[PDB]
Amino acid sequence: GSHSMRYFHTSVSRPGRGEPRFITVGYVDDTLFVRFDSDAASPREEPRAPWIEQEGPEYWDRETQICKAKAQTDREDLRTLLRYYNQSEAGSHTLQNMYGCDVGPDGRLLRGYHQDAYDGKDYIALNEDLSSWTAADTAAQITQRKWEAARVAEQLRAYLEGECVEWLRRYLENGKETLQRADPPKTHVTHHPISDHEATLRCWALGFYPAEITLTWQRDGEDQTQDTELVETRPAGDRTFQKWAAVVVPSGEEQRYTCHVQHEGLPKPLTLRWEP
């Protein structure tokens, strides 16, 4: 189906405790495949998925140079932001950057991204046109003016349309055994007495990949949205994800309640009910 590649970067200053810590990770869909941490004893970008290990020394060498280069620009940018925002040099601040691409089943570009956030707030983002910017405030507007002057969007567009798409395609092929396999959820419903008058029915999905899934309860076929407790989808640690949805049900009414599961690894949505 459709697929994505993302690189995530975070720098956190720590005045009085050395230079900002820089951590970057790359993903294809929901699979981590590369990491770099500036606090690592001998920092290099390291593989985190088997299908990338085959890349050669020139690959790893350039990736590591880029990681170190980005770490440095983040450090300078963090100094710049203290100026732009009239802030003290005393406190810890955070710079985050994400970029990447989404491709359709045929591998053509669907959307590219390149966006930054300071202290958890939007700073500057490349628009969907890959040609113009959204600056969050008058500070980001300074960067916008510089980046418009240096035609930075053209450079990113070229990457996003070119290498991003082409290398994502490469990775999808090299890691076809896992990246192109959907593992459907294993599903079941459990029952948990609360009092004499009600019980919790909890609809489980376990062992699925990728992470996207819909778990719904209905009562008499009406969605129980406002009444369902939905936990965030959570990693199991073996590549797969878990999720559950729970409702509180009046005793005796359990059969009015149906759990509905949609996952790409399932041919048809499932309907479950509690089976005592």
């Binding site: 690189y7 990681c67 940018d77 710049t80 932001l81 732009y84 930075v152 990113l156 990457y159 290498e163």
Partner: peptide, 9 residues
Amino acid sequence: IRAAPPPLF
């Protein structure tokens, strides 16, 4: 594969 870093802010 990664992109080259953009210019400073």
